[PDB]
Structure formats: C-alpha cells, structure tokens
Amino acid sequence: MKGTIVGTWIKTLRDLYGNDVVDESLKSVGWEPDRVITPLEDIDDDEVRRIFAKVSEKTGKNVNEIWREVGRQNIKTFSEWFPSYFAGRRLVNFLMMMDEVHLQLTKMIKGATPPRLIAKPVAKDAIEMEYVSKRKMYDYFLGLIEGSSKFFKEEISVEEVERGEKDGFSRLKVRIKFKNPVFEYKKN
Ligand code: HEM
C-alpha cells in the first residue's frame, strides 16, 4: 500500500481510538510513532493488516467496523494532507476523478496494484461506481463514499447493484444517486 496513504490511516486511527492504542499497535510491528513515511515508500499490505488487527484487539471492535469508520473519517484527513484534490470541487467531479488519481499515485510503485474505481453516469442524478481490487476492502470503500458525502455536504443514496469475486479480483458496484441532477444530455 502506498506509504503516504497508510500515513493518513494512522492519523485517522489516532482521531478515532487514541494515541495509546495506535502507538501500541505500531510498536507491535516495529514502527516508531514519530516515523515519517516518504512519497516513494510502499508499505507491505500484511503490515497494515497486522496494525489493524492490533487496533481490533485493543478496542474490541471488529476489523471490518474499523475499516468502515476509517473510511468515513479519512476523507477529512485527505482534505488536510492532499488539499489540491478538493479545492472547491463538487462531489460528482471528485468521485469521477478518483480512478485516474489512484493510477497516478501508484504509477511508480514497486508492483503497483491500485484499486480501480470507474464511475459512469447512468442518469441525470446518478452514477454507477465499480470498485475492483484484489484486496476486497469493501468497508473502506463504502466508508470513503459516505465520508465524501458528509465532507462535500451533498446528500446521496448508495445502493448496491452487485458484488462478486473472480480470479482473485473482488468487485462491488454501487449506484450513487444525488438529490439534485448533476448531468444533462449533450449530443454525442
Ligand atoms: C484525495 C483522496 C484520495 C486519495 C489521494 C487516494 C489515494 C489512494 C491511494 C494512492 C491508495 C493506495 C493504493 C495502492 O497502494 O495500491 C488508496 C487506497 C484506496 N482508496 Fe483511495 N484515495 C482517495 C480517495 C478515495 C475515494 C473517495 C475512494 C472511493 C470512492 C477510494 C477508494 C480506495 C480504496 C478502496 C483503497 C484501498 C485499497 C484497495 O482496495 O485495493 N479512495 N487511495
């Protein structure tokens, strides 16, 4: 997992559960609370799993519940650490921009396997976003969408269209409907 993104999760975990829980979890994997992750660093996915596992044991919360809360609260962290991706944009533009963003930030990473997040208009007031990844982080995905709604102050409804797993890849397709139209028909 791209290092600087893991850095945001650590900060978000501190907001949710405290410096003690987090410091203890990082210590269990040999980290240093004051460690500064660089833009070119890649953090082993298994290390992230162990960190979250420790948070789970310390807080007594299910790992999936933690990922959901981290997704919900991480949008705020992103807004502070990567302000340029926000800056006055509207929720729909933000969401449709994510697929390209993930490809960009993992361009020069060791093996590079970013989640695909293709979004496409399906109505004047809705889009279909499909999560595709070997990691199956459905809860984080759904939480980030909820948090995006809260951050941008734009009410939405999220309906699961379908989910599946094939050849190692997990897929989750949701239909996001906005309260007000965000698209108009234009000649193709
Ligand atoms: C400005 C905000 C965001 C930035 C800068 C960002 C960047 C990234 C990056 C670079 C990763 C690590 C990927 C890797 O190392 O392979 C990641 C993970 C992930 N991001 Fe984002 N992200 C942002 C917002 C979002 C949004 C809004 C969604 C969903 C609607 C999303 C869904 C995910 C998922 C599900 C993962 C977990 C890894 C996986 O499932 O394979 N991200 N993000």
Coordinates of N, CA and C and ligand atoms in Angstrom, one line a residue:
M1 N 0.9 -1.2 0.0 CA 0.0 0.0 0.0 C 0.9 1.2 0.0
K2 N 0.6 2.2 -0.8 CA 1.4 3.4 -0.9 C 1.5 4.0 0.5
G3 N 2.8 4.2 0.9 CA 3.1 4.7 2.2 C 2.4 5.9 2.8
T4 N 2.4 7.0 2.0 CA 1.8 8.2 2.5 C 0.3 8.0 2.8
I5 N -0.4 7.1 2.1 CA -1.8 6.8 2.3 C -1.9 6.1 3.7
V6 N -1.0 5.2 4.0 CA -1.0 4.5 5.2 C -0.9 5.5 6.3
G7 N -0.1 6.5 6.0 CA 0.2 7.6 7.0 C -1.1 8.3 7.4
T8 N -2.0 8.5 6.4 CA -3.3 9.1 6.7 C -4.2 8.2 7.6
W9 N -4.1 6.9 7.3 CA -4.9 5.9 8.1 C -4.4 6.0 9.6
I10 N -3.1 6.1 9.8 CA -2.5 6.2 11.1 C -3.1 7.4 11.9
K11 N -3.1 8.5 11.2 CA -3.6 9.8 11.8 C -5.1 9.6 12.1
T12 N -5.8 9.0 11.1 CA -7.3 8.8 11.3 C -7.5 7.9 12.5
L13 N -6.7 6.9 12.6 CA -6.8 5.9 13.7 C -6.6 6.6 15.1
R14 N -5.8 7.6 15.1 CA -5.5 8.4 16.3 C -6.7 9.2 16.7
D15 N -7.4 9.8 15.7 CA -8.6 10.6 15.8 C -9.7 9.7 16.4
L16 N -9.8 8.4 15.9 CA -10.8 7.5 16.4 C -10.6 6.8 17.7
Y17 N -9.4 6.3 17.9 CA -9.1 5.5 19.1 C -8.0 5.9 20.1
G18 N -7.3 7.0 19.8 CA -6.3 7.5 20.8 C -4.9 7.1 20.4
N19 N -4.0 7.9 21.0 CA -2.6 7.7 20.7 C -2.0 6.5 21.3
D20 N -2.6 6.0 22.5 CA -2.1 4.8 23.2 C -2.4 3.6 22.3
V21 N -3.6 3.4 21.9 CA -4.0 2.2 21.1 C -3.1 2.2 19.9
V22 N -3.0 3.3 19.2 CA -2.2 3.4 17.9 C -0.7 3.2 18.2
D23 N -0.1 3.9 19.1 CA 1.3 3.8 19.5 C 1.6 2.3 19.8
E24 N 0.8 1.7 20.5 CA 1.0 0.3 20.9 C 1.0 -0.7 19.7
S25 N 0.0 -0.4 18.8 CA -0.1 -1.2 17.6 C 1.1 -1.0 16.6
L26 N 1.6 0.2 16.5 CA 2.7 0.5 15.6 C 4.0 -0.2 16.3
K27 N 4.0 -0.2 17.6 CA 5.2 -0.8 18.3 C 5.2 -2.3 18.0
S28 N 4.1 -2.9 17.9 CA 4.0 -4.3 17.7 C 4.5 -4.8 16.4
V29 N 4.7 -3.8 15.4 CA 5.2 -4.1 14.1 C 6.6 -3.4 13.9
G30 N 7.2 -2.9 15.0 CA 8.5 -2.3 14.9 C 8.6 -0.9 14.4
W31 N 7.4 -0.2 14.3 CA 7.4 1.2 13.9 C 7.9 2.1 15.0
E32 N 7.9 3.4 14.6 CA 8.3 4.5 15.5 C 7.2 5.5 15.4
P33 N 6.4 5.8 16.4 CA 5.3 6.7 16.3 C 5.7 8.0 15.6
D34 N 6.9 8.5 15.8 CA 7.3 9.7 15.1 C 8.0 9.5 13.7
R35 N 7.8 8.3 13.2 CA 8.3 7.9 11.9 C 7.6 8.7 10.8
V36 N 8.4 9.2 9.8 CA 7.8 10.0 8.7 C 7.9 9.2 7.4
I37 N 6.8 8.8 6.9 CA 6.8 8.0 5.6 C 7.0 8.9 4.4
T38 N 7.9 8.5 3.5 CA 8.1 9.3 2.3 C 7.2 8.9 1.1
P39 N 7.1 9.9 0.2 CA 6.3 9.7 -1.0 C 6.6 8.5 -1.9
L40 N 7.8 8.0 -1.8 CA 8.2 6.9 -2.6 C 8.1 5.5 -1.9
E41 N 7.8 5.6 -0.6 CA 7.6 4.4 0.1 C 6.4 3.5 -0.1
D42 N 6.6 2.2 0.0 CA 5.5 1.3 -0.2 C 5.5 0.5 1.1
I43 N 4.3 0.3 1.7 CA 4.2 -0.4 3.0 C 3.5 -1.7 2.7
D44 N 4.2 -2.8 3.1 CA 3.6 -4.2 2.9 C 2.2 -4.3 3.4
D45 N 1.3 -4.8 2.6 CA -0.1 -4.9 2.9 C -0.3 -5.7 4.2
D46 N 0.6 -6.7 4.4 CA 0.5 -7.6 5.6 C 0.8 -6.8 6.8
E47 N 1.6 -5.8 6.7 CA 2.0 -4.9 7.9 C 0.8 -4.1 8.3
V48 N 0.0 -3.6 7.3 CA -1.2 -2.8 7.5 C -2.2 -3.8 8.2
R49 N -2.3 -5.0 7.7 CA -3.3 -5.9 8.3 C -3.0 -6.2 9.8
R50 N -1.7 -6.4 10.1 CA -1.3 -6.6 11.5 C -1.6 -5.4 12.4
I51 N -1.3 -4.2 11.8 CA -1.6 -3.0 12.6 C -3.1 -2.9 12.9
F52 N -3.9 -3.1 11.9 CA -5.4 -3.0 12.1 C -5.8 -4.2 13.0
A53 N -5.1 -5.3 13.0 CA -5.5 -6.5 13.8 C -5.3 -6.1 15.3
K54 N -4.2 -5.4 15.5 CA -3.9 -4.9 16.9 C -4.9 -3.9 17.4
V55 N -5.3 -3.0 16.5 CA -6.3 -2.0 16.9 C -7.6 -2.7 17.3
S56 N -7.9 -3.7 16.5 CA -9.1 -4.5 16.8 C -9.1 -5.2 18.2
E57 N -8.0 -5.8 18.5 CA -7.9 -6.5 19.8 C -7.9 -5.5 21.0
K58 N -7.3 -4.3 20.8 CA -7.2 -3.3 21.8 C -8.5 -2.5 22.0
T59 N -9.3 -2.3 20.9 CA -10.5 -1.6 21.0 C -11.7 -2.6 21.2
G60 N -11.5 -3.8 20.8 CA -12.6 -4.8 20.9 C -13.6 -4.7 19.7
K61 N -13.3 -3.9 18.7 CA -14.1 -3.7 17.6 C -13.7 -4.6 16.4
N62 N -14.7 -5.1 15.7 CA -14.4 -5.9 14.5 C -13.6 -5.2 13.5
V63 N -12.6 -5.8 12.9 CA -11.8 -5.2 11.9 C -12.6 -4.5 10.8
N64 N -13.7 -5.1 10.3 CA -14.5 -4.5 9.3 C -15.1 -3.2 9.7
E65 N -15.5 -3.2 11.0 CA -16.1 -2.0 11.5 C -15.1 -0.9 11.6
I66 N -13.9 -1.2 11.9 CA -12.8 -0.2 12.0 C -12.5 0.3 10.6
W67 N -12.4 -0.5 9.6 CA -12.2 0.0 8.2 C -13.3 0.9 7.8
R68 N -14.6 0.6 8.1 CA -15.7 1.4 7.8 C -15.5 2.8 8.4
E69 N -15.2 2.9 9.7 CA -15.0 4.1 10.4 C -13.8 4.9 9.9
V70 N -12.8 4.2 9.5 CA -11.6 4.9 9.0 C -11.9 5.5 7.6
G71 N -12.7 4.8 6.8 CA -13.1 5.3 5.5 C -13.9 6.6 5.7
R72 N -14.9 6.5 6.6 CA -15.7 7.7 6.9 C -15.0 8.9 7.4
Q73 N -13.9 8.7 8.2 CA -13.2 9.8 8.8 C -11.9 10.2 8.0
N74 N -11.5 9.3 7.1 CA -10.3 9.6 6.3 C -10.4 10.7 5.2
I75 N -11.6 10.9 4.8 CA -11.8 12.0 3.8 C -11.3 13.3 4.4
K76 N -11.7 13.5 5.6 CA -11.2 14.8 6.3 C -9.7 14.8 6.3
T77 N -9.1 13.7 6.7 CA -7.6 13.7 6.8 C -7.0 14.0 5.4
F78 N -7.6 13.3 4.3 CA -7.2 13.6 3.0 C -7.3 15.1 2.6
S79 N -8.4 15.7 3.1 CA -8.6 17.1 2.8 C -7.5 18.0 3.4
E80 N -6.9 17.6 4.4 CA -5.8 18.3 5.1 C -4.4 18.0 4.6
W81 N -4.2 16.8 4.2 CA -2.9 16.3 3.6 C -2.7 16.5 2.1
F82 N -3.8 16.3 1.4 CA -3.8 16.4 -0.1 C -4.9 17.4 -0.5
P83 N -4.8 18.7 0.0 CA -5.8 19.7 -0.3 C -6.1 20.0 -1.8
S84 N -5.2 19.8 -2.7 CA -5.4 20.1 -4.1 C -6.5 19.2 -4.7
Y85 N -6.7 18.0 -4.2 CA -7.7 17.1 -4.8 C -9.2 17.5 -4.4
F86 N -9.3 18.5 -3.5 CA -10.6 19.0 -3.1 C -10.8 20.4 -3.7
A87 N -10.2 21.4 -3.1 CA -10.3 22.8 -3.6 C -11.6 23.2 -4.4
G88 N -12.7 23.3 -3.7 CA -13.9 23.8 -4.4 C -14.6 22.8 -5.3
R89 N -14.1 21.7 -5.6 CA -14.7 20.7 -6.5 C -16.0 20.3 -5.9
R90 N -16.9 19.8 -6.8 CA -18.2 19.3 -6.4 C -18.1 17.7 -6.2
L91 N -18.9 17.1 -5.4 CA -18.9 15.7 -5.1 C -18.8 14.8 -6.4
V92 N -19.7 15.1 -7.3 CA -19.7 14.3 -8.5 C -18.3 14.3 -9.3
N93 N -17.7 15.5 -9.4 CA -16.5 15.7 -10.1 C -15.4 14.9 -9.3
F94 N -15.4 15.1 -7.9 CA -14.5 14.4 -7.1 C -14.5 12.9 -7.3
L95 N -15.7 12.3 -7.2 CA -15.8 10.9 -7.4 C -15.4 10.3 -8.8
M96 N -15.8 11.0 -9.8 CA -15.4 10.6 -11.2 C -13.9 10.7 -11.5
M97 N -13.2 11.5 -10.6 CA -11.8 11.8 -10.8 C -10.9 10.7 -10.1
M98 N -11.5 10.0 -9.1 CA -10.8 9.0 -8.3 C -10.0 7.9 -9.1
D99 N -10.6 7.3 -10.1 CA -9.9 6.2 -10.8 C -8.6 6.7 -11.3
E100 N -8.6 7.9 -12.0 CA -7.3 8.4 -12.5 C -6.3 8.7 -11.4
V101 N -6.9 9.3 -10.3 CA -6.0 9.6 -9.2 C -5.2 8.4 -8.6
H102 N -5.9 7.3 -8.5 CA -5.3 6.1 -7.9 C -4.2 5.6 -8.8
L103 N -4.5 5.7 -10.2 CA -3.5 5.2 -11.1 C -2.2 6.1 -11.0
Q104 N -2.5 7.4 -10.9 CA -1.4 8.4 -10.8 C -0.5 8.2 -9.6
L105 N -1.1 8.1 -8.5 CA -0.3 7.9 -7.2 C 0.4 6.6 -7.0
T106 N 0.1 5.6 -7.9 CA 0.8 4.3 -7.8 C 1.6 4.0 -9.0
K107 N 1.7 5.0 -9.9 CA 2.4 4.9 -11.1 C 3.8 4.3 -10.9
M108 N 4.6 4.9 -10.0 CA 5.9 4.4 -9.8 C 6.1 3.6 -8.5
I109 N 5.2 2.7 -8.2 CA 5.3 1.9 -7.0 C 5.7 0.5 -7.4
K110 N 6.6 -0.1 -6.7 CA 7.2 -1.4 -6.9 C 6.4 -2.4 -7.8
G111 N 5.3 -2.9 -7.3 CA 4.5 -3.8 -8.1 C 3.3 -3.1 -8.7
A112 N 2.7 -2.2 -7.8 CA 1.6 -1.4 -8.2 C 0.3 -2.1 -8.6
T113 N -0.6 -2.2 -7.6 CA -1.9 -2.8 -7.8 C -3.0 -1.9 -7.2
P114 N -3.2 -0.7 -7.7 CA -4.2 0.2 -7.1 C -5.7 -0.3 -7.5
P115 N -6.6 0.1 -6.6 CA -8.0 -0.4 -6.9 C -8.5 0.4 -8.1
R116 N -9.4 -0.2 -8.9 CA -9.9 0.6 -10.0 C -11.3 1.1 -9.4
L117 N -11.6 2.3 -9.8 CA -12.8 2.9 -9.3 C -13.6 3.6 -10.4
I118 N -13.8 3.0 -11.5 CA -14.5 3.5 -12.6 C -15.9 3.9 -12.3
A119 N -16.2 5.2 -12.6 CA -17.6 5.7 -12.3 C -18.1 6.2 -13.7
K120 N -19.4 6.0 -13.9 CA -20.1 6.4 -15.1 C -21.5 6.9 -14.9
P121 N -21.9 7.9 -15.6 CA -23.2 8.5 -15.5 C -24.2 7.4 -16.0
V122 N -25.4 7.3 -15.3 CA -26.4 6.3 -15.7 C -27.8 7.0 -15.6
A123 N -27.8 8.3 -15.3 CA -29.0 9.1 -15.2 C -28.6 10.5 -14.9
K124 N -29.6 11.4 -15.0 CA -29.3 12.8 -14.7 C -28.9 13.1 -13.3
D125 N -29.3 12.2 -12.4 CA -29.0 12.4 -11.0 C -28.2 11.2 -10.3
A126 N -27.6 10.4 -11.1 CA -26.9 9.3 -10.6 C -25.7 8.7 -11.4
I127 N -24.8 8.0 -10.7 CA -23.7 7.4 -11.4 C -23.5 6.0 -10.8
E128 N -22.8 5.1 -11.5 CA -22.5 3.8 -11.1 C -21.0 3.7 -10.9
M129 N -20.6 3.4 -9.7 CA -19.2 3.3 -9.4 C -18.9 1.9 -9.1
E130 N -17.9 1.3 -9.8 CA -17.5 0.0 -9.5 C -16.1 -0.2 -9.0
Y131 N -16.0 -0.8 -7.8 CA -14.7 -1.0 -7.1 C -14.2 -2.3 -7.6
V132 N -12.9 -2.4 -8.0 CA -12.3 -3.6 -8.5 C -10.9 -3.7 -7.9
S133 N -10.7 -4.7 -7.1 CA -9.3 -4.9 -6.5 C -9.1 -6.3 -5.9
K134 N -7.9 -6.7 -5.8 CA -7.5 -8.0 -5.2 C -7.7 -7.9 -3.7
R135 N -7.8 -6.7 -3.1 CA -7.8 -6.5 -1.7 C -9.2 -6.6 -1.0
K136 N -10.3 -6.6 -1.7 CA -11.6 -6.7 -1.2 C -11.9 -5.7 0.1
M137 N -11.5 -4.5 -0.1 CA -11.7 -3.5 1.0 C -13.1 -2.8 0.9
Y138 N -14.1 -3.6 0.8 CA -15.5 -3.1 0.7 C -15.9 -2.1 1.7
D139 N -15.5 -2.3 3.0 CA -15.9 -1.4 4.0 C -15.2 -0.1 4.0
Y140 N -14.0 -0.1 3.6 CA -13.2 1.2 3.5 C -13.8 2.0 2.3
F141 N -14.0 1.3 1.2 CA -14.6 1.9 0.0 C -16.0 2.6 0.3
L142 N -16.9 1.8 1.0 CA -18.2 2.4 1.3 C -18.1 3.5 2.3
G143 N -17.2 3.4 3.3 CA -17.0 4.5 4.2 C -16.5 5.8 3.6
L144 N -15.5 5.6 2.7 CA -15.0 6.8 2.0 C -16.1 7.5 1.2
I145 N -17.0 6.8 0.6 CA -18.1 7.4 -0.1 C -19.0 8.1 0.8
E146 N -19.4 7.5 2.0 CA -20.2 8.2 3.0 C -19.5 9.5 3.5
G147 N -18.2 9.3 3.8 CA -17.5 10.5 4.3 C -17.3 11.6 3.2
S148 N -17.3 11.2 2.0 CA -17.2 12.2 0.9 C -18.5 13.0 0.9
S149 N -19.6 12.3 1.1 CA -21.0 12.9 1.1 C -21.0 14.0 2.2
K150 N -20.6 13.6 3.4 CA -20.6 14.5 4.6 C -19.6 15.6 4.4
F151 N -18.4 15.4 3.9 CA -17.4 16.4 3.7 C -17.9 17.5 2.6
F152 N -18.4 17.0 1.5 CA -18.9 17.9 0.5 C -20.3 18.5 0.7
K153 N -20.9 18.0 1.8 CA -22.2 18.4 2.2 C -23.3 18.2 1.1
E154 N -23.2 17.1 0.4 CA -24.1 16.7 -0.6 C -24.7 15.4 -0.3
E155 N -26.0 15.4 0.0 CA -26.7 14.2 0.3 C -26.8 13.3 -0.9
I156 N -26.6 12.0 -0.6 CA -26.7 11.0 -1.7 C -27.3 9.7 -1.1
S157 N -27.6 8.8 -2.0 CA -28.2 7.5 -1.6 C -27.3 6.5 -2.3
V158 N -26.9 5.4 -1.5 CA -26.0 4.4 -2.1 C -26.7 3.1 -2.1
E159 N -26.8 2.5 -3.3 CA -27.5 1.2 -3.5 C -26.5 0.2 -4.1
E160 N -26.4 -1.0 -3.5 CA -25.5 -2.0 -4.1 C -26.2 -2.6 -5.3
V161 N -25.5 -2.6 -6.4 CA -26.1 -3.2 -7.6 C -25.7 -4.7 -7.7
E162 N -24.4 -5.0 -7.4 CA -23.9 -6.3 -7.4 C -22.5 -6.4 -6.9
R163 N -22.1 -7.6 -6.5 CA -20.7 -7.8 -6.0 C -20.3 -9.2 -6.5
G164 N -19.0 -9.5 -6.5 CA -18.5 -10.7 -6.9 C -17.0 -10.8 -6.8
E165 N -16.5 -12.1 -7.0 CA -15.1 -12.3 -6.9 C -14.7 -13.3 -8.0
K166 N -13.7 -13.0 -8.8 CA -13.3 -13.9 -9.8 C -11.8 -13.7 -10.1
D167 N -11.1 -14.9 -10.2 CA -9.7 -14.8 -10.5 C -8.9 -13.9 -9.5
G168 N -9.3 -14.0 -8.3 CA -8.7 -13.1 -7.3 C -9.2 -11.7 -7.1
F169 N -9.9 -11.2 -8.1 CA -10.4 -9.8 -8.1 C -11.8 -9.7 -7.4
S170 N -11.9 -8.8 -6.5 CA -13.2 -8.5 -5.9 C -13.8 -7.3 -6.6
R171 N -15.1 -7.4 -6.7 CA -15.8 -6.3 -7.4 C -17.1 -5.9 -6.6
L172 N -17.3 -4.6 -6.5 CA -18.5 -4.2 -5.8 C -19.0 -3.0 -6.6
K173 N -20.2 -3.1 -7.1 CA -20.8 -2.0 -7.9 C -21.9 -1.4 -7.2
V174 N -21.8 -0.1 -6.9 CA -22.9 0.7 -6.3 C -23.5 1.7 -7.2
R175 N -24.7 2.1 -6.9 CA -25.4 3.2 -7.6 C -25.5 4.3 -6.7
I176 N -24.9 5.4 -7.0 CA -24.9 6.6 -6.2 C -25.9 7.6 -6.8
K177 N -26.9 7.9 -6.1 CA -28.0 8.9 -6.5 C -27.9 10.2 -5.8
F178 N -27.8 11.3 -6.5 CA -27.8 12.6 -5.9 C -29.2 13.2 -5.7
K179 N -29.4 14.1 -4.8 CA -30.7 14.7 -4.6 C -31.1 15.6 -5.7
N180 N -30.1 16.2 -6.4 CA -30.3 17.1 -7.5 C -29.6 16.7 -8.7
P181 N -30.2 16.9 -9.9 CA -29.5 16.5 -11.1 C -28.1 17.1 -11.2
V182 N -27.1 16.3 -11.7 CA -25.8 16.7 -11.8 C -25.3 16.6 -13.3
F183 N -26.1 16.0 -14.1 CA -25.8 15.8 -15.5 C -26.9 16.2 -16.4
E184 N -26.6 16.5 -17.6 CA -27.6 16.9 -18.6 C -27.2 16.2 -19.9
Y185 N -28.2 16.0 -20.8 CA -27.9 15.3 -22.1 C -27.3 16.2 -23.1
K186 N -26.2 15.8 -23.7 CA -25.5 16.6 -24.7 C -25.3 15.7 -25.9
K187 N -25.4 16.2 -27.1 CA -25.2 15.5 -28.3 C -23.8 14.8 -28.3
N188 N -23.9 13.5 -28.7 CA -22.6 12.7 -28.8 C -22.0 12.8 -30.1
Ligands
HEM1 C1 -8.0 12.8 -2.3 C2 -8.4 11.4 -1.9 C3 -7.8 10.2 -2.2 C4 -6.5 9.9 -2.5 C5 -5.3 10.8 -2.6 C6 -6.4 8.4 -2.5 C7 -5.3 7.7 -2.8 C8 -5.2 6.3 -2.6 C9 -4.0 5.5 -2.8 C10 -2.8 6.0 -3.6 C11 -4.3 4.3 -2.3 C12 -3.3 3.1 -2.2 C13 -3.4 2.2 -3.4 C14 -2.2 1.2 -3.5 O1 -1.2 1.4 -2.8 O2 -2.3 0.2 -4.3 C15 -5.7 4.3 -1.9 C16 -6.4 3.2 -1.4 C17 -7.7 3.0 -1.6 N1 -8.6 4.0 -2.0 FE1 -8.1 5.9 -2.2 N2 -7.7 7.9 -2.3 C18 -8.5 8.9 -2.2 C19 -9.9 8.8 -2.2 C20 -10.6 7.6 -2.4 C21 -12.1 7.5 -2.6 C22 -13.0 8.7 -2.5 C23 -12.4 6.2 -2.8 C24 -13.6 5.6 -3.1 C25 -14.8 6.2 -3.5 C26 -11.1 5.5 -2.6 C27 -11.0 4.1 -2.5 C28 -9.8 3.4 -2.1 C29 -9.8 2.1 -1.7 C30 -10.9 1.1 -1.6 C31 -8.5 1.8 -1.4 C32 -7.9 0.6 -0.6 C33 -7.0 -0.4 -1.4 C34 -7.8 -1.4 -2.3 O3 -9.0 -1.6 -2.1 O4 -7.1 -2.0 -3.1 N3 -10.0 6.4 -2.4 N4 -6.2 5.5 -2.1

